[PDB]
């Protein structure tokens, strides 16, 4: 059940709600009040997916799709089969994600560590809200939101991009992509570096913090350092969505033309036209 070093950490306390009532483990899993709400929302959400999928045409997991309502239903409730299941499942998803975040807060307090992880996890929750809640509110229908299906959600991303002719020219997207790419590079560099120091090979000795910094000063003239690459990593990753959200929100509510045309602000300055 327990890791060899675990027992000393398994103390009472650190909860946000309920005190001792839900302050326990089941197997490796800490429960807490938010463990209980998470499971509630998961069970309810997965039930609604099951029921909705059975009323649909197929059981192939690649082809199942629970879709939002037609635009004409605006911000109202829709009949279950034609958007209402999507609406209910969306609420359950938010319930589950927020519960999951708040549970991590409780786990952090018990261990006497920083709350940085749940903080970081707010970012993808926020982005999910941008796609499914905020942007649909600004356009006036839940129908602008994405459908729940393995492949169907890609068809939505696809058409959404082509609604603005070439989405690659969206400046918020350019920022988002750049952070996606540099984050993946940086994780490889950081992971590679640490492994290279601890595993030089051929019975050679484990190297040092000084070797770490020497390697990057040699290769690129600068090393950000041990703590700071972790700060940077969080910053880079978080900015995939923090910058991306602007490009998403802007498309429709604040810009209706193609995204390449947006760059007219630069191209059509009279000085060089």
């Amino acid at each position: 059940a327990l890791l060899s070093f675990e027992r000393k950490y398994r103390v009472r306390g650190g909860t946000l709600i309920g005190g001792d009532l839900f302050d326990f483990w089941v197997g490796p899993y800490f429960v807490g009040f938010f463990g209980v709400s998470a499971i509630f929302f998961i069970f309810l959400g997965v039930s609604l997916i099951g029921y909705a999928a059975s009323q649909g045409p197929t059981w192939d997991p690649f082809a199942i799709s629970i879709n939002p309502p037609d635009l004409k239903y605006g911000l109202g409730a829709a009949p279950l089969l034609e958007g209402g299941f999507w609406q209910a499942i969306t609420v359950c998803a938010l319930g589950a994600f927020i519960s999951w975040m708040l549970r991590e807060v409780e786990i952090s307090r018990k261990l006497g560590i920083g709350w940085h992880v749940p903080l970081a996890f707010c970012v993808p929750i926020f982005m999910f809200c941008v796609l499914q809640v905020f942007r649909p509110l600004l356009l006036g229908s839940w129908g602008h939101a994405f459908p729940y299906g393995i492949l169907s959600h890609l068809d939505w991303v696809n058409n959404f991009g082509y609604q603005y002719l070439n989405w690659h020219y969206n400046p918020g997207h350019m920022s988002s992509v750049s952070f996606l790419f540099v984050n993946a590079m940086a994780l490889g560099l950081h992971g590679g570096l640490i492994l290279s120091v601890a595993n030089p090979g051929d019975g050679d000795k484990v190297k040092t913090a000084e070797h770490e910094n020497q390697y990057f000063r040699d290769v690129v003239g600068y090393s950000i350092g041990a703590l700071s690459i972790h700060r940077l990593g969080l910053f880079l990753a978080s900015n995939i969505f923090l910058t991306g959200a602007f490009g998403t929100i802007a498309s429709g509510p604040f810009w209706t033309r193609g995204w390449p045309e947006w760059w007219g602000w630069w191209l059509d300055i009279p000085f060089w036209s």
């Binding site: 799709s65 879709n67 939002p68 309502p69 037609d70 635009l71 004409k72 034609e82 958007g83 999507w86 600004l138 356009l139 006036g140 229908s141 129908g143 602008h144 939101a145 994405f146 459908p147 169907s152 068809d155 939505w156 696809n158 058409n159 959404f160 991009g161 082509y162 609604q163 603005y164 002719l165 070439n166 020219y169 802007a250 429709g252 509510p253 604040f254 810009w255 209706t256 033309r257 193609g258 390449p260 045309e261 947006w262 760059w263 007219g264 602000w265 191209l267 060089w272 036209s273």
Partner: protein, 332 residues
């Protein structure tokens, strides 16, 4: 930089596919007001007296009309094409049967062209049809035409800057960009696809696996054809003031059936109509036009989708004068 909310949106596919139009109300309203300038139909006249083939001396196309009908046609033509210049744009004051001014002969061919559009191309123009106004908008030179190279501005009523002018070589990339909705695509889709019927627009294979004998080396279409098709599609979209999802489910651009809207099929017929118009009616007019109308390769100005549509999915928001002017088609 930006356009304030709200946006008007429509649905063109199954819910959850993000297919539909996205429109800025102020932009739609400005285009509505521009297009509302379409002059109303002139009052109907009763058909009286002999056909103008017996009355007048040089009537080859509208000979079936009576005098009052025919003079009504001529007043309408003047309003649509040359309201500021008047009847004398095409006519000698002292001899109305003289063909000595070039606009006379061109106008005759335009009458035939317009009749052909409304009779042979109903698959595109339906019961709405076109008149002279659809293209001309009250000037002899239509505001949106194409040469065999790109020109700025798109509206020839605006005055070009030095860089915009076709002779300034440094502005070529910007001339091309603004015809392809500001993309950097390095292809002129007018000369490639709309001036004639030589090129195929379709580039996507219709099989999962590559067929042996078309899939290696010089057997293959170069990737450039895909860039060019995309450039045509950018240009088409901008010319109708819409986006790809008006015609396609982007899941599969190449598929018809449920993967395309009826507007896609209408657009298809539109590509054919424009080719017919350019090859058989508009391009031959370089013989009958002065040199100041021709482009740098001696070409007459020609038509694309914008020529009629001018940034709207239906030209003039579906306004029609077909019933009001039977003599412009359809012809039995």
């Amino acid at each position: 930089c930006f356009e304030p909310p709200p946006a008007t949106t429509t649905q063109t596919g199954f819910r959850g596919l993000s297919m539909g139009e996205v429109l800025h109300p102020a932009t739609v309203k400005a285009k509505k007001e521009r297009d509302a300038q379409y002059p109303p139909a002139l009052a109907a006249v009763k058909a009286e007296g002999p056909p103008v083939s017996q009355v007048y001396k040089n009537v080859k196309v509208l000979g079936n009309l009576t005098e009052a009908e025919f003079l009504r046609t001529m007043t309408a033509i003047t309003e649509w094409v040359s309201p500021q210049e008047g009847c004398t744009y095409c006519h000698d004051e002292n001899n109305l049967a003289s063909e000595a001014k070039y606009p006379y002969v061109v106008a005759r061919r335009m009458l035939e062209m317009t009749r052909a559009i409304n009779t042979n191309w109903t698959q595109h123009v339906a019961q709405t049809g076109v008149t002279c106004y659809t293209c001309h908008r009250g000037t002899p030179l239509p505001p949106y035409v194409r040469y065999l190279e790109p020109t700025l501005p798109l509206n020839n009523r605006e005055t070009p800057t030095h860089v915009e002018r076709v002779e300034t070589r440094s502005g070529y990339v910007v001339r091309l960009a603004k015809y392809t909705a500001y993309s950097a695509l390095n292809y002129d889709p007018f000369t490639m696809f709309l001036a004639n019927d030589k090129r195929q627009v379709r580039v996507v294979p219709q099989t999962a696996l590559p067929l042996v004998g078309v899939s290696r080396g010089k057997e293959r279409r170069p990737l450039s054809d895909a860039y060019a098709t995309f450039a045509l599609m950018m240009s088409i979209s901008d010319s109708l003031g819409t986006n790809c999802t008006f015609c396609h489910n982007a899941q599969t651009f190449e598929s018809w059936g449920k993967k395309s809207t009826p507007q896609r099929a209408i657009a298809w017929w539109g590509i054919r109509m424009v080719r017919d118009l350019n090859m058989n009616y508009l391009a031959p007019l370089n013989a009958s036009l002065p040199a100041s109308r021709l482009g740098r390769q001696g070409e007459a100005p020609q038509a694309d989708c914008r020529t009629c549509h001018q940034g709207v999915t239906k030209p003039l928001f579906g306004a029609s004068r077909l019933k009001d002017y039977p003599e412009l088609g359809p012809i039995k």
